[PDB]
Amino acid sequence: ILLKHGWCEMLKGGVIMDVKNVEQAKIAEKAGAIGVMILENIPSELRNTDGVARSVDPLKIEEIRKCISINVLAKVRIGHFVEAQILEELKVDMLDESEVLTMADEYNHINKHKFKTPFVCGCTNLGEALRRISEGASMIRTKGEAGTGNIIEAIKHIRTVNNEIKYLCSLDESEVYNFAKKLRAPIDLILLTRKLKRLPVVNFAAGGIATPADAAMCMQLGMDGVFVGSGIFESENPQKMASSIVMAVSNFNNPKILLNVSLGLGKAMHGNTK
Amino acid sequence: ILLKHGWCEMLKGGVIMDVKNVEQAKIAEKAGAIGVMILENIPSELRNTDGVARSVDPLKIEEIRKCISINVLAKVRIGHFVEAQILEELKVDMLDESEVLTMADEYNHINKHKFKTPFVCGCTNLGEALRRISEGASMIRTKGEAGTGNIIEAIKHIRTVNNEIKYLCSLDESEVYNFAKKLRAPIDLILLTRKLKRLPVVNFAAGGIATPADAAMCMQLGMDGVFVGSGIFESENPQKMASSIVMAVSNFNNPKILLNVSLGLGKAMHGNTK
Amino acid sequence: NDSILLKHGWCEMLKGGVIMDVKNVEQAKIAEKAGAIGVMILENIPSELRNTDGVARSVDPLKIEEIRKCISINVLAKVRIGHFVEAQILEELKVDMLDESEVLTMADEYNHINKHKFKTPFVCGCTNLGEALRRISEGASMIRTKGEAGTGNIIEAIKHIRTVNNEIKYLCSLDESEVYNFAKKLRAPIDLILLTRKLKRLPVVNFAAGGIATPADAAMCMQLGMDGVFVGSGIFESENPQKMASSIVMAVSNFNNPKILLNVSLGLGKAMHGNTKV
Amino acid sequence: NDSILLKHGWCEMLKGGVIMDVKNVEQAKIAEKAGAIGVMILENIPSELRNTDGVARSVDPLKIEEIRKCISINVLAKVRIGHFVEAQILEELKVDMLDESEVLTMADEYNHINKHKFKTPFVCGCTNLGEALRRISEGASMIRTKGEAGTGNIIEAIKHIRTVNNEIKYLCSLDESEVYNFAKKLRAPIDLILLTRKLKRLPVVNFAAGGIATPADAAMCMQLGMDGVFVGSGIFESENPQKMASSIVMAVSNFNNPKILLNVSLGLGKAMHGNTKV
Amino acid sequence: NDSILLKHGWCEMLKGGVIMDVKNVEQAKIAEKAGAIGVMILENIPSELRNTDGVARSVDPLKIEEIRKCISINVLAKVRIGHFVEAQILEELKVDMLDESEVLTMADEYNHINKHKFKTPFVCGCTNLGEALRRISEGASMIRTKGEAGTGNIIEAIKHIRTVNNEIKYLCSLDESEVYNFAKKLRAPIDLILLTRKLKRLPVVNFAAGGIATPADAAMCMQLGMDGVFVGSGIFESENPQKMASSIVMAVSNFNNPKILLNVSLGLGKAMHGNTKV
Numbered sequence A, B: 001i002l003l004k005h006g007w008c009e010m011l012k013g014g015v016i017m018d019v020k021n022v023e024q025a026k027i028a029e030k031a032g033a034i035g036v037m038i039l040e041n042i043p044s045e046l047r048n049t050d051g052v053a054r055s056v057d058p059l060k061i062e063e064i065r066k067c068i069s070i071n072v073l074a075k076v077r078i079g080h081f082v083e084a085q086i087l088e089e090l091k092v093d094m095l096d097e098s099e100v101l102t103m104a105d106e107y108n109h110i111n112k113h114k115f116k117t118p119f120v121c122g123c124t125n126l127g128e129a130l131r132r133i134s135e136g137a138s139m140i141r142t143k144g145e146a147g148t149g150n151i152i153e154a155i156k157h158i159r160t161v162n163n164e165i166k167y168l169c170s171l172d173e174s175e176v177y178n179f180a181k182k183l184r185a186p187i188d189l190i191l192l193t194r195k196l197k198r199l200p201v202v203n204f205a206a207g208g209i210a211t212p213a214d215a216a217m218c219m220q221l222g223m224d225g226v227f228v229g230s231g232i233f234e235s236e237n238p239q240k241m242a243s244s245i246v247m248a249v250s251n252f253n254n255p256k257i258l259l260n261v262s263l264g265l266g267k268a269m270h271g272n273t274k
Numbered sequence C, D, E: 001n002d003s004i005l006l007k008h009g010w011c012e013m014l015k016g017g018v019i020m021d022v023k024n025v026e027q028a029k030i031a032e033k034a035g036a037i038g039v040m041i042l043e044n045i046p047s048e049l050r051n052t053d054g055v056a057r058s059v060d061p062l063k064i065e066e067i068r069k070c071i072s073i074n075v076l077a078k079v080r081i082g083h084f085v086e087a088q089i090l091e092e093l094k095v096d097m098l099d100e101s102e103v104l105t106m107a108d109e110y111n112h113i114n115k116h117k118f119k120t121p122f123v124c125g126c127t128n129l130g131e132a133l134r135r136i137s138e139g140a141s142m143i144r145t146k147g148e149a150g151t152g153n154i155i156e157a158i159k160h161i162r163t164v165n166n167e168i169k170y171l172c173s174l175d176e177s178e179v180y181n182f183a184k185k186l187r188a189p190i191d192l193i194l195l196t197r198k199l200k201r202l203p204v205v206n207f208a209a210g211g212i213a214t215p216a217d218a219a220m221c222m223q224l225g226m227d228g229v230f231v232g233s234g235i236f237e238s239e240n241p242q243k244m245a246s247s248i249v250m251a252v253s254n255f256n257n258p259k260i261l262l263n264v265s266l267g268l269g270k271a272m273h274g275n276t277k278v
């Protein structure tokens, strides 16, 4: 039912961070992250490599879980219901069926209704978000452009979803059906979304967040929170970058604080344009 | 709710006939039609004309209704909710939001949930049928190729819907979501359709039915009934054509009867290939 | 500003009304007898102008003289797009309103009339919000849809109604920072975009126009939130012009009443045949 | 198997024969008087169906009744491709054979009739070996060429004859391992391909059909190894139908005899004008 | 028929099993120690063959001799597509099964091996139902998916599994009359299509093959209804081949048990890096 949602609700105002190990995960707990996202590799280092990126060894997760007390999350390949089965069995707080890993099924996503473990999925537009939720995702995030340290695609996606909801809310009761068709989304979720003027699940920004300014910007555009990986551990000073981002996120409307935690941060991740 | 469906159920095994007047409508009652479909013009005569085809003068309907006792049905232009409002007010047994009339709205169909009067809509494939029902249609029909007297498009549509339901029923629980997207149909009706191995409403053949053999063929392919217009009143002998088609439809698996009522029928409508 | 407010004051009184195209006195009295709030005087009705390749210009002023003294409702006329001199003449003839219309043959392909230089209010057509706002920016006091004039087919008018109406609602939802690129996209003047946003509607009276053949068509345009209707071809190319005219007016006045709408469609006669082009 | 063998037994008796299209009793007796082994009953002959855009369906059964009691030779009829119900009716009327024909307007664009569900034997058309074998796979008991029906032009029938006949000889030459990819290429059922290979011919009677206008045309089809001929338009649109009909039959019976072939072409009259399309 | 039934009897015993590619004795014992039901003997594993432009042929028979006397499980080998002579040699060497494989360099681009001429059973690859049925029609006793061999990426195998599995279910739903055009569309032999339809599955054992890098991948293929798995590159290019091999087998034997599946993935080591091509 919706204890899944209930669980996700506690994430509002939070930062989840990608970690490949214990020190990284400890740094994250010390920063005030509400959760870590455990990966073999963090997206920036997965970008010049043509290997098959799979969900992480479950031993790696246990090692890390016992050394921190915040929520523990992991990635699964799109469509790989067995990697999910294994991790659900292991008990994780949340699964991210993620495009950063190598797709396991080119046409079907995981039937997320078959799990007690809640799922987060990626999205770049309203129809896609609503399709992920129809399959049972409990939470959404933008895809951005993982590991590039460039906020632009994240911003595009945040606004695309927002503007489509606005167009949706501008439509009269009869116009919503043809819209549903165009979006290729289920009418029932389209109508609920219209009812709320937002997505019916929690909705985080993700991909390319490199500075506290980026994190706060996503928040000011109405996101419920943020995922950050590359931006922390590719930066000059990861603990301090991690800490500032969480502060930015907790105080996104406070320029005094945004200034303060932005001072003296060191070099952000170089990132990659193109 | 579903007294709408309930009403439609009584149509199973029936023939509805297009009439532009009283004699034609009387001929239809005498043939054993369960209903007439009242039009300014019948589709064959609407095909070499470039006029705007609208729903019929409501006086014409009253004139005809009082002179017969079978069900009375009329056409409305696609998207013309006011022509519907007027006819719902007049009390008709059923509305056909029909492609044979001149579309009034190029993007939106009538919000059929706003009416007590039940609606029939056209279709050529499963997704389209399910979109019409999502908008509140209580009954579906194929579009065929109205007024051409050629059964081929009707047959295509009957089988397209059937084969898509079969593909739908061949899919596992996770595969149904991507299918829904491809069909651009609402998941909830897709799942109900899958649950039944047929459309969730009554489903008639329509367009191009010219002989008892055609009518029975549609029936043998699993339709619940038939609409015929041009095939009757463009034929050499309309009363006898009307009578035979109803017999064919009531006895579609009976070759002895199909033969009998096909004998001596006169020339069917010339029709139009191309 | 005061001349703009003055013209807007005037146009408000058209709200809820029907304006009928006419060629002659005979037709204008049919219109007044029907309850039209005004007539729009034409050399030819749009259904006739589709059937010729002639140049279509504003009416001889004599015909506005002749008609106007036989009726007491508002008198309007069409001028060709960009033809500021045709307007100067009718401004001098004193007429209640001008329609710079795409139904006549354009006179200037790049410039509409600078409508600010006239005390007579203008109505212009639009198919979307930016176009409307551009027309209003040039001084139009009123807007109508274009639809497909003279075809008796409602489909384009309905598209145009919905497009503007959705664009207006969407614009109102945008954050104030997003309104600049949207203005660019619509190629509309920001300040008229900010005004629509503050009003939550078009800043002028806005009528449905094009292809209205029945009371159902008129009432539909009203149910989609229009303030009124223009009807040309659908009256005088129908079987019974008088009764078609009167029932359109009742439909516009009573657009949310099925009973009346039914009542006035009964035995109405054959509507304009129309043209659903080949 | 036994029903298949039973139908094949029946079709053999057509070998060496001519089957003539007819519309009426008058024509059917001309056919019987000519020595045709059967008539094929039609609402319209193919030359007439090229000159209309009408939907072309199987004949009223009454007309099969009327004709059949005036003649003693075989009675056949056409059903539309995929129209299994038209077939059910004629199966019930009892007729000697059905032709699921491309000359009538297709009823189903993806599926032919499941011919196995009928005791009446079917003939179908083909333009190549795979098509034939597919038709036989669906239960056809007999095959004919399509040619160009009703044009009076022999050129397509000859292509179709040669294509199948060469494909059959080539198939027989292939090594057994090569027969699988060839089956794929022809999109034919392997087992009917292995059967043709073991028989060194089509597994069914195979007639020439389409555009046969003279005894020379019929005899040519026979010299290319066909078992028989269908002729529609070439008889009753010729100058002297009776004499054209009788001389075709003699030509088919005597297809390797120049003297007779000469003899029956003499003073035959003007053959169908035909249509060598623009 | 009896030789076919005899071969099918044999292939059944592979059900539930894992077959592992090997190059040498050392690897084959790792496979036997892991519980593989057989090894597939190769000059090079597929991950190595992607990294060269060499011609890839069946293994030197000496290497089948050497390996076979050091293990007691089934011994299989690859022959090049269409290379019936390579098969004749291995048939003469007596090996438990042959794989006519697309991983080796094709020997004939138009013809696969006529597998009926061998007592040794063959396995072939497929990416859809028609292909499978064609392979079985040529005498394959067993089928596997192709997937993307040597890439360690499961995505193509999963597509291939689903396609065949859906096509099989759909075929079973079709009415008997629709089965002919579907056979044409798949370019498959009708009689093997009718057989799949009567069995409601492929008429042969059917394994998953290509890109299986983890126990999760193997178990997924089994949950999608496959009867078994082949694994090449994913074992011996992983960190700990022995433990990866044993845990794959347990996953295949216990594919519906999360607890075990978890248990055998724990601390497994780094799986083959793989290649998600540029």
Ligand SMILES: *C[C@@H](O)[C@@H](O)[C@@H](O)COP(=O)(O)O
Residues within 6 Å of the ligand: C021, C045, C046, C047, C099, C101, C103, C145, C146, C147, C148, C149, C150, C151, C152, C209, C210, C211, C212, C230, C231, C232, C233, C234
């Ligand atoms: C300008 C005026 O004639 C409008 O009515 C025009 O756009 C549509 O008129 P009609 O009713 O003749 O289509």
Ligand SMILES: *C[C@@H](O)[C@@H](O)[C@@H](O)COP(=O)(O)O
Residues within 6 Å of the ligand: D021, D045, D046, D047, D099, D101, D103, D145, D146, D147, D148, D149, D150, D151, D152, D209, D210, D211, D212, D230, D231, D232, D233, D234
């Ligand atoms: C079906 C039958 O009419 C055949 O003869 C046809 O394919 C050719 O007939 P025609 O001799 O009229 O060309």
Ligand SMILES: *C[C@@H](O)[C@@H](O)[C@@H](O)COP(=O)(O)O
Residues within 6 Å of the ligand: E021, E045, E046, E047, E099, E101, E103, E145, E146, E147, E148, E149, E150, E151, E152, E209, E210, E211, E212, E230, E231, E232, E233, E234
């Ligand atoms: C032929 C055999 O090597 C199959 O495994 C091949 O198609 C896939 O192997 P891999 O596991 O190396 O991808």
Ligand SMILES: *C[C@H](O)[C@@H](O)[C@@H](O)COP(=O)(O)O
Residues within 6 Å of the ligand: A018, A037, A042, A043, A044, A096, A098, A099, A100, A142, A143, A144, A145, A146, A147, A148, A149, A206, A207, A208, A209, A227, A228, A229, A230, A231
């Ligand atoms: C998938 C992961 O949770 C998410 O962080 C990525 O999409 C973006 O991470 P960055 O490395 O871009 O911060």
Ligand SMILES: *C[C@H](O)[C@@H](O)[C@@H](O)COP(=O)(O)O
Residues within 6 Å of the ligand: B018, B037, B042, B043, B044, B096, B098, B099, B100, B142, B143, B144, B145, B146, B147, B148, B149, B206, B207, B208, B209, B227, B228, B229, B230, B231
């Ligand atoms: C719309 C109407 O109900 C339906 O009859 C048409 O689509 C087909 O009628 P025919 O004239 O083809 O019989």
